[PDB]
Amino acid sequence: KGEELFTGVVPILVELDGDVNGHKFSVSGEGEGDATYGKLTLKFICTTGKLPVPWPTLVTTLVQCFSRYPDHMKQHDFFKSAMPEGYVQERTIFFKDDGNYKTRAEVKFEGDTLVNRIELKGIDFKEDGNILGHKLEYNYNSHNVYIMADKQKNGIQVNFKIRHNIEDGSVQLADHYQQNTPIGDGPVLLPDNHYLSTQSALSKDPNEKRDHMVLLEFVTAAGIT
């Protein structure tokens, strides 16, 4: 079924159209995912000029079908079960004492490539807050992403908190509320409650002259015994 599409390395493309406080931008990403290992390797470029928000604030928006589901949890992997037609992923992300992002994405195959196409709208940001002021460290914490069948028993409702390190040594919370709904109408796996355990490392390409982010991530499902 959809799980079979992920047994080796799969190319990824990401495209994001954003508008935060009227500052418009676009981001393109490319790389590969290896769900057997829960690994992602990607590079993202801002194709419109300078990114008006910090790269770390966009990590969660910029393919949870690449999470590693251990064998005893495979009946809980909604994300691969929806493929290849894919799913809609919607979020609101509330930055404590600052503005919010609202995002809508479609994640699906296009040919042999897994594509994440996103629209993002951010509003009510402070002009010199941590986000528009670029006051975040260039790194990423490790998180638990909590997953539960949705009310309609059609997709999943997801909740978690991201912690962004700030350059003054404090931490700013980004409270995530997420819904995923299959694009096709045939059966998908509806999971028992569980979570994903995430870790990420960010870097730069020394030869890349555009504003950009190199991202490597490891994600493993857990919380079923």
Q: Which residues bind K ion (CB under 5 A)?
A: 134
Q: Is 153 exposed, middle or buried (0-12, 13-18, 19+ CB in 10 A)?
A: exposed
Q: Are strands 113-123 and 10-20 parallel, antiparallel or unpaired?
A: parallel
Distance CA 21, CA 127 (A): 9
CB of 122 to K ion, least distance (A): 17
Q: Looking at beta carbons only, is 6 or 125 nearer to K ion?
A: 125
Give φ, ψ of 135 to 5 degrees: -110, 10
Q: Looking at beta carbons only, is 43 or 134 nearer to K ion?
A: 134
Distance CA 11, CA 32 (A): 4
- Name the residue whose CB lies closest to K ion: 134
The token pair at 125 is 């940001």
Residues 6+ apart with CB under 8 A from 82: 2, 65, 180, 182, 183, 184, 188
Q: Looking at beta carbons only, is 23 or 134 nearer to K ion?
A: 134
Helix (H, G, I), strand (E, B) or coil at 110: strand
Q: Looking at beta carbons only, is 148 or 166 nearer to K ion?
A: 166
Helix (H, G, I), strand (E, B) or coil at 76: helix
CB of 141 to K ion, least distance (A): 6
CB of 70 to K ion, least distance (A): 22
CB of 175 to K ion, least distance (A): 20
Q: Looking at beta carbons only, is 102 or 134 nearer to K ion?
A: 134
| Per-residue buried b or exposed e for 191-214, using 16+ beta carbons within 10 Å of the residue's own CB | beebbbbbebebeeeeeeeebbbb
Q: Looking at beta carbons only, is 6 or 140 nearer to K ion?
A: 140
CB of 164 to K ion, least distance (A): 11
CB of 177 to K ion, least distance (A): 23
**Rounded to 5 degrees, what angle do the CA atoms 3, 84, 176 make?**
80
